[PDB]
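Field notebook, page 328. I keep forgetting to write these up properly, so this time I am using the form the group agreed on. The chain and the ligand, 8VC, are recorded exactly as supplied. Prediction of the bound pose follows.
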Amino acid sequence: SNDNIELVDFQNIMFYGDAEVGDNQQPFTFILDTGSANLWVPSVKCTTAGCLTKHLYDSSKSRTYEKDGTKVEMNYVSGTVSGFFSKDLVTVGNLSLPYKFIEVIDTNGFEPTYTASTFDGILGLGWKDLSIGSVDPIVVELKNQNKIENALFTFYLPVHDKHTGFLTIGGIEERFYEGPLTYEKLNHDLYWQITLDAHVGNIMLEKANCIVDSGTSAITVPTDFLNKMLQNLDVIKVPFLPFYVTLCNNSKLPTFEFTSENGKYTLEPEYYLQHIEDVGPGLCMLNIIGLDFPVPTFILGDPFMRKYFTVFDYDNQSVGIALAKKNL
Ligand SMILES: Cc1cc(N(C)CCN(C)C)cc(C)c1OCC(=O)N[C@@H](Cc1ccccc1)[C@H](O)C(=O)N1CSC(C)(C)[C@H]1C(=O)N[C@H]1c2ccccc2C[C@H]1O
């Protein structure tokens, strides 16, 4: 059997899951992020305003706590947290392991994201060589300890109103998907990144890097490619922000089509549009952001993963992709 962690939707933009730290089972809510490779929780030693409404970690209450204290700063694209390393029993679903994590004491570099969102910490689901402190990934460690069948995990993302989701550790369950499951070989050692041809109508990018990322709540697109997409599309940019607004029923809005020799994955407007009726009637925001990597790259974030069930397979160094079942 497999370890199943339930995923709760947060206003159709993101999702969260719970896990515990300490032998007294101190509860936390996590962003589960395939794009990073460290676990962190806010500490009772936290000095900053963000920590005020969070579940906090108290090492003195856990008899399995092992002191480390090495200083560490965790830099993400959207901000920084700092604190120090600690080690304790981490439990995910019904499995436990001793695990090295970051006790965060300063979250001021992660504002306003942190105070506005209802997560306590971030649980990384990436590769070891992307971690600070050379930490073996949780799922690799669980496999090594014979607590799961395979060194893989899967995401069946919740759909607002329709159903909850699951992060499943250790194997692939048929209940989550329909049609074929296609495996795409990783093109990098330490990112969940695959090679796909990216088509949006006339515009194409041959053999683009495509990162499948659970922690990114948009599709990201190279800026040049995006500028070509938005030309004559009747969308308007929000002042001061990298977001475009449209009429929801704008007939011009294209369908993303990513292809390999193995498979074909499409993303229609209904999957990348976000209603903003409160802002104005019949108005939608595109969940699409222009971003230039050194090599042309798309991030296939939460909107892609809402449509597609995904398998992250360490042993076979690949990402599996299938159409998510509309219900459970
Ligand atoms: C950890 C790390 C270490 C090293 N190093 C140096 C390691 C070296 N080691 C040996 C010490 C080098 C790198 C690059 C690295 O990755 C940094 C990192 O931030 N990666 C992001 C993915 C990404 C990557 C590139 C460009 C955009 C996004 C992460 O996985 C994620 O998903 N994050 C951050 S925190 C969050 C909230 C979980 C969510 C995030 O920011 N989400 C926001 C976002 C982002 C883009 C577009 C829209 C939106 C809306 C919102 O969802």
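OBSERVATIONS:
- The CA atoms of residues 19 and 92 lie 5 Å apart.
- The chain has five helices and 24 strands.
FOLLOW-UP: compare against the apo run.
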